[PDB]
Amino acid sequence: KIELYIPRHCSVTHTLIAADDHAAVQILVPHVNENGVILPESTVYTVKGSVRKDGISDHSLNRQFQKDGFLKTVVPKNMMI
Amino acid sequence: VRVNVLADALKSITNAEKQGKRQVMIRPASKVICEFLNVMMKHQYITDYTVVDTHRSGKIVVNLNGRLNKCAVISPRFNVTLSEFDKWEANLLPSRHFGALVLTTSYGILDNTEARAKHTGGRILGFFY
Amino acid sequence: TNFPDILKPSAEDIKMMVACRVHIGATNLNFAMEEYVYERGNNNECIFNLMKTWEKLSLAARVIAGISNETPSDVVAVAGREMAHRASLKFMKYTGCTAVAGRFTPGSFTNQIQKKFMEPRLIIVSDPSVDHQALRESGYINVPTIAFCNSDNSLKNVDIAIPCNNRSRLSIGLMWWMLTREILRYQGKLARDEKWDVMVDLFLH
Amino acid sequence: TSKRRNNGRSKKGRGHTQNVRCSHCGRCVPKDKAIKRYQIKNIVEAAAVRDISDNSALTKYKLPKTYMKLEYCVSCGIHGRVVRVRSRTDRRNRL
Amino acid sequence: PLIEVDLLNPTAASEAKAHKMKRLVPTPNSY
Amino acid sequence: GRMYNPGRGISRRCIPYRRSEDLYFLMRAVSVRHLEKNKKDKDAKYHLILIESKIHRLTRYYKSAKVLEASFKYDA
Amino acid sequence: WTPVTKLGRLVKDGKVKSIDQIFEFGIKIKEYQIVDHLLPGLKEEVMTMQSVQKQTSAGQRTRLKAYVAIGDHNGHAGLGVKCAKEVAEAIKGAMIQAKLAMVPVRRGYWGATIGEVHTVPCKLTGACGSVRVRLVPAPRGTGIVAAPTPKKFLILAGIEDVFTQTTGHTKTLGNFVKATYDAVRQSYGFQTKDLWKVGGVKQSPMDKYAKILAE
Amino acid sequence: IFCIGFTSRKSNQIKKTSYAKSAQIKKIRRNPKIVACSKVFSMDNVYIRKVK
RNA sequence: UUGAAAAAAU
RNA sequence: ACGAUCAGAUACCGUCGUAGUCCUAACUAUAAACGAUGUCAACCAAGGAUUGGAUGAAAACCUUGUUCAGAACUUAAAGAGAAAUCUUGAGUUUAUGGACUUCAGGGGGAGUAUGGUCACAAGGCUGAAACUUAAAGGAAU
């Protein structure tokens, strides 16, 4: 095949992840049931290296977590875009 | 002073995308800047935009989605004949399959692939990867 | 859905956090921590939102629980400040997560030739200001980090930040106590409808 | 090249400043570039204040102190051990 | 700033703080 | 910024979102030309040149706009 | 043999098959024996053997610095540097660093998608120090139009057609190869139009087999 | 008759330097109680240093 | 308080 | 001009002292005249403090919040660069084009010769060539 692989896409910046990027992470948030016990199913978030080193990863993720429903009111309404 | 409003807007959009910002703001909005965005919107490089009227050539808010690499203006708009296209494409665009030029022709503000189809030349406005 | 109804903070948990003045923070406010701050106190100090503290607390515990539910040793809990040494040590006891007690020897995540070289997949730090070294080494091993950040600390190389007081003896012990209990609840090894046997005083320094 | 960001002076938004005189040499040095030191000393040293108070013609005289402000050129400052050649990183320290 | 906020719909308080010409639609502070 | 000095003042009147001589005042030039007694005032002898260069720009424009008569010329 | 890393453990028992499986998830290669397992038959090239010196009280302490470029011609390459007191040790030391510094090379077509890949996909520029190297895609027939120093490296990376334009002090070879390797190294970070698609949900090998390596 | 004075600090004052404006200074121009100018600035060290 | 100088190529 | 020191001292060191140092009038037009950083405009991370207004509270001066303009400072894992370092740019540049003006082309010869012009003068401005030579130089170890 022409491509060597399909590179990951950062969930925060919607930009590619380098093969030499050793600051990028991968946060897995398992789904929880009505009882409140984790499940083998999970959703994967990827954050680029340069995002972390600025102080933005924590706030950027809260935008994604709140959108996906893992948080309820952490991020105010006027800060969601 | 502000010689070129288009240059100021494109350089503002490029800076925001490098920082990974979700949206940008352009203070003086013209018809040429609005029409330049439609070429970028038709290629899905930017989500959309909102021309807010302020009675003073109102501002613009542009939504970006992690796709634009660089959009740049070109200083004085050179008259580009149809035979001078691939000379300009071979300079300003990274590859034959990726980039996109913008020309202000008599048939509106078109890109290179549809000004060639429309069979017209014109002054060159800028480009965007 | 994603945040079911079994996850509100029960009145017991809120009662102790105000008692341990968890919501009470420092004076200088980092820009990245403005969202968690609700209002400024009477002598110009930040007051964290208790709900925002809990929502981030559970979310951090959920991430730890998933990673630590099959490989407990793949979680590392570092704690530099002498105050948080006991609480970090009990967190290790009840979950199996490795916990570096005192000084963090630089290169313990990068130098493979080291005898004490550990390669985790998640790192929990007690204080980003004191444990900046551990956070910086993560940026070399692609390992996400979780911090008990305060209103003045720098949020560089932290992904999940829990806004809580990380200087007082009570709050340091209490928050680690809640994190351990929440992790066990997600694991299913501790029912949500019962009371945890171990009291907070065990975690206290 | 540039050993200092402020070029050793303390002048930012002006063009000229009056000269002063080095206290040990008399060299003309600019006011902002001068090494400024303030000295408060008793007129009577500790080795003699006992004798002065002993046979004193007054009841509750409080001995005075001098107040002189000294300015040195850089060459006289270093040689006089007022200031030292600090480390390359210690140069930035301003306390 | 680094913590990005919405631009199209500014908060009610935020437009009160900013300079009169720097609001989304410049309005005077007089009557 | 300003026309001559490097100042950058942005104070402006703010017309709301609802729609429901200067050349004469610049002749200031007379007042400074005070200069007859303070002959050594090299400052006011410079700020007068700045004022007079402004007048030669407003005259140059009011003639193009066909406002002033074509024979106009400022002089003492 | 007997690796000391989590990823290195997976490779030895044949759990990670392809090298690119490592490259997708950014897992750092910390043992050179891993590359020799998933990349057999790596061709060898030695670029230069330059001697540095250090003035001492007694005399000059000379050490020999060796640049070696490694990589198979199927889109993988790496460059390593090592200085030591002996020539044999310098090449062996640089051998290891070259393998640890492996980087995938993205290549595409010039104008038509007629197999197989020959040239770089877009315009790339690598910035070492004063030396800057720019790679331009070229048609099928054109070889590697470049200086003898990066042409040796570009052969190993498996790029047959390319147009190069160089700027800076190219007479220093250390920066010339590093600037070439720096150009290729970022070939996969340039998000073109065809890479817009998010892609399916995958799993890191260090997470798929996390329970297995625990014992 | 020569008089001297100095602008003083304040109990709650935080900034180190307490200078008066040029416009403010011209307003201030056996016991010296001159001080109550306390409606113009804060003054503490008021003396008569010479009489000729 | 005084302390000047050290041929060319290796 | 003397007296010291010295091999010598026409110098630093000490003493005396003409022009000069001050003002007025007319010239001169150069400085390491420096931020060695042209003018104008757009964007641009975090923080404390300060000069002058405006605006709320706190009973002109002080304490606090917003905002405008000015001289500055601190941090960067980021951007640039050869590096020192720069960040209110020296960033947004082989992914090269915002507008305009001036200047430079290895080191000497040389800001020299000649021509022109300005000045009472010293001098300033414009300003080469023959010839000579593999280096001259910048930042850091």
Side-chain angles (χ1 to χ4, degrees):
Chain A
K1 56 169 206 180
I2 39 154
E3 296 270 85
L4 282 183
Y5 61 85
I6 285 71
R8 283 138 69 215
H9 274 271
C10 162
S11 99
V12 159
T13 39
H14 305 107
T15 324
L16 282 185
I17 301 269
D20 47 69
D21 195 6
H22 303 309
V25 301
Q26 263 218 6
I27 271 159
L28 272 70
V29 192
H31 309 93
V32 98
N33 56 28
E34 316 84 12
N35 164 17
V37 152
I38 57 129
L39 280 74
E41 307 337 327
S42 39
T43 160
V44 190
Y45 300 105
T46 317
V47 197
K48 209 171 51 79
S50 64
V51 165
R52 268 171 90 215
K53 301 193 240 138
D54 310 343
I56 280 310
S57 39
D58 180 86
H59 168 74
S60 275
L61 285 183
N62 300 357
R63 282 205 310 237
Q64 202 59 56
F65 292 143
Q66 172 150 342
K67 245 183 56 64
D68 275 333
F70 297 105
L71 315 175
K72 280 328 269 190
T73 165
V74 174
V75 157
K77 40 167 215 56
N78 69 84
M79 267 194 184
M80 301 275 318
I81 40 189
Chain B
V1 281
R2 306 183 87 113
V3 181
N4 204 358
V5 278
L6 191 42
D8 300 345
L10 291 191
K11 199 94 130 163
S12 313
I13 286 165
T14 299
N15 294 330
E17 199 33 67
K18 292 202 217 239
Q19 308 173 225
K21 299 250 174 260
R22 276 313 170 77
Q23 57 181 196
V24 86
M25 180 314 279
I26 291 124
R27 215 183 62 72
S30 167
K31 277 198 322 273
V32 74
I33 322 193
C34 293
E35 259 85 64
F36 194 98
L37 297 185
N38 294 5
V39 197
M40 266 164 19
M41 200 196 308
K42 281 203 251 283
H43 300 69
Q44 292 141 292
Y45 277 101
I46 67 163
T47 297
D48 43 37
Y49 65 84
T50 295
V51 174
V52 36
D53 165 45
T54 78
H55 265 170
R56 289 162 254 240
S57 71
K59 342 194 161 196
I60 270 176
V61 188
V62 161
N63 298 57
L64 316 106
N65 47 353
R67 254 146 189 194
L68 195 56
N69 272 315
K70 163 173 207 181
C71 58
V73 84
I74 293 286
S75 39
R77 300 132 189 234
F78 289 130
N79 48 322
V80 184
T81 312
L82 253 163
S83 62
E84 295 174 6
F85 267 29
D86 34 3
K87 169 209 146 45
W88 275 106
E89 318 262 36
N91 306 356
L92 309 185
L93 294 191
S95 77
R96 334 188 41 196
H97 333 112
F98 184 20
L101 285 180
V102 170
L103 296 108
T104 159
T105 70
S106 187
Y107 306 100
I109 302 193
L110 324 167
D111 89 8
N112 48 322
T113 36
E114 61 156 19
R116 208 174 222 129
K118 216 147 308 196
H119 211 43
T120 188
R123 308 215 157 284
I124 170 166
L125 273 202
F127 65 100
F128 54 91
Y129 292 11
Chain C
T1 67
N2 287 318
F3 205 98
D5 310 41
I6 198 69
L7 299 186
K8 333 322 182 173
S10 58
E12 175 230 352
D13 320 58
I14 304 285
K15 174 252 171 193
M16 311 145 48
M17 291 199 275
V18 51
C20 304
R21 40 214 307 107
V22 157
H23 60 302
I24 286 290
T27 48
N28 197 282
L29 165 66
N30 189 289
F31 83 107
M33 291 276 248
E34 219 290 319
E35 50 194 317
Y36 308 134
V37 156
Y38 164 80
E39 236 193 293
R40 291 257 198 201
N42 251 313
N43 65 353
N44 191 4
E45 101 282 359
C46 327
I47 292 171
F48 306 141
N49 201 333
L50 282 313
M51 260 334 273
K52 292 181 178 156
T53 302
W54 178 274
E55 297 207 13
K56 286 298 249 151
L57 177 71
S58 75
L59 177 76
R62 190 195 296 219
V63 183
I64 305 160
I67 276 175
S68 164
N69 92 313
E70 77 277 47
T71 57
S73 84
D74 269 17
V75 182
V76 170
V78 317
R81 171 168 284 105
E82 57 263 351
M83 182 56 58
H85 288 174
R86 180 138 203 239
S88 160
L89 260 284
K90 312 304 270 302
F91 168 87
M92 165 168 167
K93 163 174 228 179
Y94 292 107
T95 78
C97 312
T98 48
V100 164
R103 155 202 169 72
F104 177 84
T105 287
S108 35
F109 297 156
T110 37
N111 217 3
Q112 61 272 351
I113 208 172
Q114 250 180 18
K115 271 287 313 302
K116 211 170 287 257
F117 163 67
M118 51 215 68
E119 181 69 13
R121 294 191 276 108
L122 192 69
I123 302 173
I124 320 166
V125 311
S126 97
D127 184 4
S129 164
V130 174
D131 302 9
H132 65 271
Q133 173 53 41
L135 293 178
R136 265 199 73 114
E137 257 163 272
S138 91
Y140 298 75
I141 52 172
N142 292 105
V143 161
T145 63
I146 291 155
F148 289 93
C149 261
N150 200 332
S151 79
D152 51 21
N153 311 149
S154 92
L155 268 71
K156 256 187 197 74
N157 285 6
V158 294
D159 306 309
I160 319 172
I162 333 291
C164 58
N165 203 9
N166 39 42
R167 314 255 164 84
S168 38
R169 49 180 322 275
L170 316 155
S171 67
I172 276 186
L174 163 69
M175 301 295 327
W176 281 90
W177 180 84
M178 278 175 174
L179 200 85
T180 323
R181 198 198 41 195
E182 261 310 307
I183 280 165
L184 296 174
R185 289 200 199 166
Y186 279 98
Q187 298 264 86
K189 323 168 28 158
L190 187 81
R192 302 232 175 220
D193 20 66
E194 54 154 308
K195 180 212 183 45
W196 207 20
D197 41 281
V198 25
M199 58 221 59
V200 202
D201 286 342
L202 264 176
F203 280 61
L204 261 293
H205 160 245
Chain D
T1 89
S2 207
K3 189 165 257 237
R4 271 161 220 97
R5 143 170 279 242
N6 62 346
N7 293 333
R9 333 176 44 114
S10 82
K11 128 190 163 194
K12 278 312 175 162
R14 53 210 39 90
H16 191 234
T17 38
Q18 56 270 59
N19 290 4
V20 305
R21 292 272 162 177
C22 167
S23 210
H24 169 63
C25 212
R27 162 172 232 290
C28 262
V29 84
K31 195 192 188 180
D32 53 68
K33 202 189 173 197
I35 286 183
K36 253 90 63 182
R37 300 272 165 278
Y38 201 2
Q39 299 215 347
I40 301 184
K41 264 218 313 165
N42 327 71
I43 45 155
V44 199
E45 292 312 310
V49 71
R50 155 75 95 83
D51 305 43
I52 308 302
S53 48
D54 186 36
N55 34 63
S56 170
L58 307 135
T59 35
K60 274 307 211 86
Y61 195 52
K62 170 95 179 186
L63 290 194
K65 330 196 170 166
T66 90
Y67 308 93
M68 59 207 258
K69 168 193 154 186
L70 301 178
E71 322 157 73
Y72 310 81
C73 73
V74 162
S75 324
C76 286
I78 289 154
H79 178 67
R81 284 172 174 81
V82 167
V83 298
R84 259 107 173 170
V85 174
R86 308 202 276 177
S87 317
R88 179 149 201 285
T89 69
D90 296 343
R91 253 160 227 161
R92 309 275 323 283
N93 183 285
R94 212 161 173 286
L95 291 191
Chain E
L2 202 60
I3 289 304
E4 172 67 0
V5 314
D6 216 315
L7 282 91
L8 209 48
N9 330 88
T11 90
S14 153
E15 289 301 86
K17 305 196 342 213
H19 191 217
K20 60 170 192 159
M21 300 291 327
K22 304 198 160 20
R23 293 169 188 147
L24 189 45
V25 163
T27 65
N29 311 343
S30 33
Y31 35 84
Chain F
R2 299 264 73 73
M3 206 154 144
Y4 293 136
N5 63 87
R8 276 124 183 69
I10 80 167
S11 193
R12 274 159 113 78
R13 90 164 155 177
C14 201
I15 290 316
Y17 193 85
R18 159 181 137 128
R19 289 157 184 177
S20 70
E21 161 202 301
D22 58 74
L23 166 85
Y24 160 82
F25 272 150
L26 226 47
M27 300 151 109
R28 299 226 306 204
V30 162
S31 98
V32 187
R33 179 140 40 193
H34 166 252
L35 230 57
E36 70 210 358
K37 315 153 170 269
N38 303 91
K39 197 167 318 293
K40 259 178 78 208
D41 197 342
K42 309 249 197 184
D43 207 42
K45 291 193 157 153
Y46 168 76
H47 283 146
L48 179 67
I49 279 159
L50 297 193
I51 283 163
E52 277 176 339
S53 297
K54 257 181 212 167
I55 300 174
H56 299 349
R57 277 160 112 160
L58 299 183
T59 280
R60 189 185 323 265
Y61 153 71
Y62 283 140
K63 285 177 176 157
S64 300
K66 273 300 237 175
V67 173
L68 287 174
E69 76 279 352
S71 60
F72 191 85
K73 155 186 121 205
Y74 155 75
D75 41 10
Chain G
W1 55 291
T2 69
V4 301
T5 39
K6 285 228 294 295
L7 160 77
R9 282 209 283 277
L10 292 179
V11 171
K12 183 141 200 71
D13 320 62
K15 291 320 166 302
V16 176
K17 309 295 307 146
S18 186
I19 173 63
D20 305 277
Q21 184 85 346
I22 290 146
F23 282 144
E24 281 146 289
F25 308 87
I27 314 306
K28 203 169 179 168
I29 308 164
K30 286 165 104 39
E31 292 165 306
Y32 78 103
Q33 52 149 94
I34 297 158
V35 170
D36 296 359
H37 221 338
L38 312 182
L39 264 200
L42 282 190
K43 199 167 141 15
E44 200 30 77
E45 283 248 32
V46 160
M47 311 296 248
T48 185
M49 261 295 318
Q50 140 192 24
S51 101
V52 279
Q53 272 178 300
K54 167 184 150 152
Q55 187 100 271
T56 44
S57 318
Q60 300 149 11
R61 175 224 77 180
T62 307
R63 294 200 301 176
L64 298 132
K65 186 200 237 188
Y67 294 83
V68 308
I70 219 174
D72 77 2
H73 314 71
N74 300 128
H76 311 107
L79 180 95
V81 193
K82 171 62 131 223
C83 49
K85 199 80 54 202
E86 283 76 57
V87 195
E89 185 202 334
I91 312 171
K92 284 153 38 200
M95 272 310 167
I96 305 183
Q97 314 306 138
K99 293 160 180 172
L100 300 153
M102 186 78 38
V103 150
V105 181
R106 173 182 209 236
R107 44 214 188 138
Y109 297 98
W110 181 49
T113 179
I114 295 320
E116 61 285 40
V117 279
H118 59 141
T119 206
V120 311
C122 51
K123 277 197 245 144
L124 312 157
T125 309
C128 206
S130 86
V131 198
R132 267 130 201 86
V133 184
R134 182 200 208 196
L135 302 166
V136 190
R140 271 238 160 230
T142 52
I144 306 141
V145 186
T149 309
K151 190 172 155 164
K152 293 223 293 293
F153 180 84
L154 284 171
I155 271 167
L156 303 166
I159 288 177
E160 35 255 45
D161 317 337
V162 74
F163 278 150
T164 67
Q165 278 179 307
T166 324
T167 274
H169 203 107
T170 79
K171 268 190 278 140
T172 193
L173 178 167
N175 294 30
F176 207 179
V177 285
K178 286 187 207 221
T180 304
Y181 164 100
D182 197 10
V184 132
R185 196 216 71 232
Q186 50 202 51
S187 44
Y188 254 109
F190 195 68
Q191 178 191 14
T192 73
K193 173 149 184 166
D194 42 59
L195 297 171
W196 289 0
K197 195 46 75 190
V198 278
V201 164
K202 311 288 191 50
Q203 227 168 84
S204 282
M206 308 222 308
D207 273 81
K208 297 228 225 206
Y209 295 36
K211 226 290 297 183
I212 286 91
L213 43 79
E215 79 284 336
Chain H
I1 295 171
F2 292 84
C3 169
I4 215 184
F6 292 94
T7 75
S8 64
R9 250 215 188 194
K10 297 216 59 92
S11 33
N12 51 352
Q13 157 137 352
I14 281 297
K15 62 168 196 137
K16 154 169 78 188
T17 83
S18 51
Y19 304 123
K21 299 188 248 142
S22 164
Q24 275 175 345
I25 280 171
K26 310 187 174 164
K27 268 63 135 177
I28 327 191
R29 272 196 211 111
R30 64 258 215 169
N31 296 323
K33 249 81 170 170
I34 289 318
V35 155
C37 93
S38 66
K39 312 308 294 149
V40 187
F41 219 91
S42 180
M43 302 213 57
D44 62 346
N45 241 341
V46 172
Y47 288 96
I48 295 198
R49 58 176 220 82
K50 174 163 291 182
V51 168
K52 276 187 204 184

